[PDB]
Paper text:
The crystal structure of ScHfl1(368-389)-ScAtg8 fusion protein was determined at 2.45 Å resolution. ScHfl1(368-389) has an elongated conformation with a short helical conformation at the residues 374–377, and forms extensive interactions with the W-site, the L-site, α3, as well as β3 of ScAtg8, burying ~2400 Å2 of surface area (detailed interactions are summarized in Figure 3—figure supplement 3A). As is the case with SpHfl1, ScHfl1 neither forms an intermolecular β-sheet with [name] β2 (bottom), nor uses a canonical [name] sequence for binding to the W-site and the L-site. Unexpectedly, Tyr387 of ScHfl1 binds to a hydrophobic pocket formed between α3 and β3 of ScAtg8.
The structures showed that the [name]-[name] interaction is mediated by noncanonical mechanisms—using [name] sequences adopting helical conformation (termed helical AIMs here) and in the case of budding yeast, involving a previously unreported binding site on [name].
Residue numbers in the entry:
A (entry chain D), F (entry chain A): -22 to 114
B (entry chain E): -22 to -12, -10 to 114
C (entry chain G), G (entry chain F): -23 to 114
D (entry chain C): -22 to 116
E (entry chain B): -22 to 115
Write the structure that this text describes.
């Protein structure tokens, strides 16, 4: 025959997390040496003008959802608030939950342009590093 | 497998996040007078020949923000030059007008920032400047 | 959280361009106010401040000398031209190595002329003494 | 807003002279060749019959106030003293300060008529040159 | 620009005399000691043999105009009247107003020669002192 | 600073008479009544006994110089000629010009004594009136 | 104008020269008047003064005795020569210490002679008696 679809994953209305699923996420900087990161940023900047290459990773201690995407090609004219919404849609965080982002331990203002934040805060490797979190540090 | 760069964000008009909570308060409201006067005193002692400007956006204006509001302006700079410093900091395109206000007046372009400071400095030693995309 | 620190990050700049789109317009004093208002004003101020010459001091249009937002000067009658000139200098923060010139009726008043005497001969029909300053004699 | 009047200069501890306001003082004679000057004095004689045309300039070394007027059309019937008072009014020299005038380096008597002083002391170019000072700069 | 001539003194309400204009000249005899005066007159006689050396000053109480010349080298053949006209022309006294002169408080006749007046009235110091006035006081 | 002597009058092309110098040009007799004149001559007779009191005035039609002295106290022994020289010197008439004197409209001889002239011609008031002139009437 | 004062300023002086140009015609009576006029005059006198001798009395030319302007003398007929001589002496004011002489036709008339008798003998054809006076006897 053929298997039928059944809505049977009711759970005990708390769904426990698997006790032994060992996925070992690392920081972007730790996975790639500096020279590789700089070559990549130069290549992306050349290939995508008017785009800010953002490495966006989750704060270590925050239970805000993760996602497998950390590379964001942000149009230079986007505001901080707009980029934050891009992240929200990507991780599918419901609007009632706050989201915060950090560039070097500071909360960028909503109406600042990503290009300006980049101009001030880009890494020596050419990327803009952004941490996102569900709680203010 | 490494993650690929994708030009997938350019996709209409871009809505603002509904719950991204930054303080967004005025400098004077965040710090008491005595702390502010102490700061301006120290900066005057630390950076001679510099005008310490607290530069903030007018609340009702949709001109971009930036995270810098403390500006150490060389005393010989003109108003117009300082305005350009603000523009480049917030990256306002040149086709868009920018205005600044000291005591609710548009200071002249060719005035020296040192003279504007001498006339308009706050009781706490700072020069408070508001920037805007409009002049209402 | 962390307070913004002061950075001396503007002085090191290679250049300092003037802003290309800061649309402030400086009007002539006479052009902003009708005659009868200005005459009423000069009378009112003269009455309120005896022993004072009320001067409207504005920058010559073609001069790149610094401007300033003060143009109403309540000058002691006993001051000389030179002393008043120094008052203007200090107000606009023009460094002393830079020459400064002023004009009443498009003529350069001599130092040690008294402002009271300059006023006696050159006061406007509206009661103010109009003085133009410039960094380049014209 | 509109700019308000403030009496903010009267309370100054001092009032220095400007260190770089360069006025180029030139004697009237040095500014014009003899031809222009004689032509002018003649024109004035024809146009202003009962008037003595006086070029009145400050003695260089004197601390008396200056003024930008140096051409004085003095009615001929005026005495020296009356003309001197005209100078005082024009430069606003306070009465407690003496003032001196000189024609050909001499102090004319107060009751001489300007017409007579002109008759004897007029320049070859038709003008009467008188220098004023706050002291006797020829004694 | 260039200063223009203005007939701006003639319209004045009044014409007061200056309140602090100094008189550096008293009577000729009192300003110089006798020996200097006699030496001077001798010098003039040597240099000018056909000249009467006159010290001519205004009477004290007279409002007739003054003049700065008090030394007159009068030709000996001049009449009193001719010398009187010389004084009138020097001080610019209009002909409609009378002029009088005095030697030793007396009016010399209009047709006496100045040499004769000198011969009788010369001072001990060699000069002839003449007082002029607009009225007959003595 | 002292006024210098300048020969600035002799140069002149002409020398006009003053148009308004009003000095009385009148005769001694018209200025004083007979009583005052006789009183004066009597006082003089007492005060100067050996002196002849002469009132010497110019003929009015004559252009000869005047002088302010008209009272002459003449030594009794002087001749007419000597007295004439006294008049000439007082008025400074140059010798090349003739001089005449008249007593009662007659030319007295140069060698008569003034005392004799007085004896014959004295006025009723006690004076001797003498007219001098540059012309002979 | 104060009254001229009397001054004894002539007698003082050291010399008293005669005027160098006082030209009075010295002329004898006969030379000035023709015989007809003289005779006519003497006849008029003879009718008008019948008891008077008409004498023309003039000074001798070379004599330094004083002159006088009277030369016509109407002499009382009873006068002696000497009395008439005294009349001459007093008219010319010759002091008595000095001698006086008179001449009729170059001869000295006696003192006690009557003038009428001298006239009878010496009268001119023109009717006058001519007498010359002098300080010497020629």
């Amino acid at each position: 025959p053929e298997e039928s679809w059944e809505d049977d994953i009711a759970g005990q209305r708390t769904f426990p997390e698997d006790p032994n699923y060992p996925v070992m996420k690392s920081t972007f900087k730790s996975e790639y040496p500096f020279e590789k990161r700089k070559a990549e940023s130069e290549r992306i900047a050349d290939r995508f003008p008017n785009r800010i290459p953002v490495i966006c990773e989750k704060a270590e201690k925050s239970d805000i959802p993760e996602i497998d995407k950390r590379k964001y090609l942000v149009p230079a004219d986007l505001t901080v608030g707009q980029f934050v919404y891009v992240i929200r849609k990507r991780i599918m965080l419901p609007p009632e939950k706050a989201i915060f982002i950090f560039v070097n331990d500071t909360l960028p203002p909503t109406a600042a342009l990503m290009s300006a934040i980049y101009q001030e805060h880009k890494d020596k490797d050419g990327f803009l590093y952004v941490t996102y979190s569900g709680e203010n540090t």
